[PDB]
Amino acid sequence: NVLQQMEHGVAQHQLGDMNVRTDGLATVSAVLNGRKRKIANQYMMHFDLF
């Protein structure tokens, strides 16, 4: 499974993000894209590096 999962990750292009080089608040982002009205939103999860 790890071999399969190593082909992916949170960081893609204009779809996901990773801010881990921080002073203690690493986040992982993801853009939710709307088809009917072209409304987009961004969601985060915050990790405690302390």
Partner: protein, 99 residues
């Protein structure tokens, strides 16, 4: 910031059902600006596996109006356009031997 409240309007604290109806525009209109057909096209740790599930198009242009005729094209208009395109005999069928 800006505190919000009732001002020079006969509004009071009410119940949820009567207060949602009372604030009609500030909910129905905003929901149209805020909501959408939101969808996730990506997943970390997994790959999109496509499925053939009969993608749906709308069967008919639902016309409204109780009196009059609609603005649809005359029934022999697109038929004459297809016949003209067929005359040019350019229909593409293969891409490097592959259909």
């Amino acid at each position: 910031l800006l505190e919000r409240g009732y001002g020079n309007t006969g509004f009071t604290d009410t119940y949820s059902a009567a207060g949602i109806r009372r604030t009609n525009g500030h909910i129905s209109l905003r929901l149209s600006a805020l909501t959408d057909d939101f969808e996730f096209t990506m997943h970390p740790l997994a790959r999109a596996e496509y499925k053939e599930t009969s993608r749906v198009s709308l069967t008919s242009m639902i016309y409204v109006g109780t009196a009059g005729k609609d603005l649809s094209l005359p029934t022999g208009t697109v038929e004459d356009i297809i016949g003209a395109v067929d005359g040019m005999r350019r229909v593409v069928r293969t891409i490097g031997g592959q259909t």
